[PDB]
Amino acid sequence: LYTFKELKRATKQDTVSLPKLKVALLGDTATQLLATAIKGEGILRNYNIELWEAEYNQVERQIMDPTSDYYQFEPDYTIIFHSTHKLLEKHSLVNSDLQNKLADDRLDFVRLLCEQGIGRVIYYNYPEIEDTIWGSYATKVQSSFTYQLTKLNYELMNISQAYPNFFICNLAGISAKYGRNFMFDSSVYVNTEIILSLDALPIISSRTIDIIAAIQGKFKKCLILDLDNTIWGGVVGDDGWENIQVGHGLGIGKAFTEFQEWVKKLKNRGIIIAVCSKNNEGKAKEPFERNPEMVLKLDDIAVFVANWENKADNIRTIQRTLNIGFDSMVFLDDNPFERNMVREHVPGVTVPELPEDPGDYLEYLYTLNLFETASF
Ligand SMILES: [Mg+2]
Ligand SMILES: [Mg+2]
Incomplete structure (x- = not known):
């Protein structure tokens, strides 16, 4: 805007x-x-x-x-x-x-x-x-x-x-x-x-x-997600897969559930979902595999990239795998340094300035209308 x-x-x-x-x-x-x-x-x-x-x-x-x-x-x-x-x-x-x-x-x-x-x-x-x-x-x-x-x-x-x-x-x-x-x-x-x-x-x-x-x-075709504190509360590497914040009951975990439900709707209308996370791949996949409160499952994720390399390089890897334009991609990450580096190093990728409170992510994303389209 x-x-x-x-x-x-x-x-x-x-x-x-x-x-x-x-x-x-x-x-x-x-x-x-x-x-x-x-x-x-x-x-x-x-x-x-x-x-x-x-x-x-x-x-x-x-x-x-x-x-x-x-x-x-x-x-x-x-x-x-x-x-x-x-x-x-x-x-x-x-x-x-x-x-x-x-x-x-x-x-x-x-x-x-x-x-x-x-x-x-x-x-x-x-x-x-x-x-x-x-x-x-x-x-x-x-x-x-x-x-x-x-x-x-x-x-x-x-x-x-x-x-x-x-x-x-x-x-x-x-x-x-x-x-x-x-x-x-x-x-x-x-x-x-x-x-x-x-x-x-x-x-x-x-x-x-x-x-x-x-x-x-010209319209977006792909959403790339960070994991920790983006689609669940907490840090999986430190807290464990059973302990990420997601699910009903009071508190921020419910916000992550409702945010994942929004992502699920995107996937269900043909938006390609990818993960780009600073994590050991095994650990990053574990909540998808083991935690019943996850809304998103591994089969919702087209390309899953978790390693300790800079996210700019990882997004190029994702782009090359999918063969769609960088300018058709949206990247969501709760870390301002990650956002800023992807912005500078991969021009074309849309990197929304997510607010600090996860309870405010979705209403903020609503203001951007990221996924306008012209075909079913
Ligand atoms: Mg994060
Ligand atoms: Mg992360």
């Missing part, structure tokens, strides 16, 4: 070398900063982004008019930003008959957009704004904003499964973590029509570019 300042600075960089992509952005709130952020983020991801911005609140206007500037632009990607905030206003101004059709009408427009067949579409879904008009009782009232929005987000996912060209960017899931209190800045919105806060902007640009990059064929 970058700051908006860094993203804007990047838009000034020399773009000659980079492959060009034409990106259209159309929204119902003010999009000028988001445009800058997307363009700069793309450049930092090695794309020369030519970004066309529709005029304020002309989404339907541009898409509905075949002679419009939008179609003349012939974009490679079309990013649509329909905000929950503006949909909330739309809903509030109509009677129950039209409110009952809020989701359906929006879904119709989305399908119409998909049917045009114009490059790939990236579409932000809708974080819930609970209006508390009914309280929680809103779930029982079809015409309520809460019901319509829940229906809308569900059917949007079904649209993405029907149209290979249509990608959602999960603004809703992103916002669920940070909260609207952080994502939305009322004072700025009132005076500028900008709906995302300054600190939210780089989060959304990064998540938008993650999708574009994945479609272009």
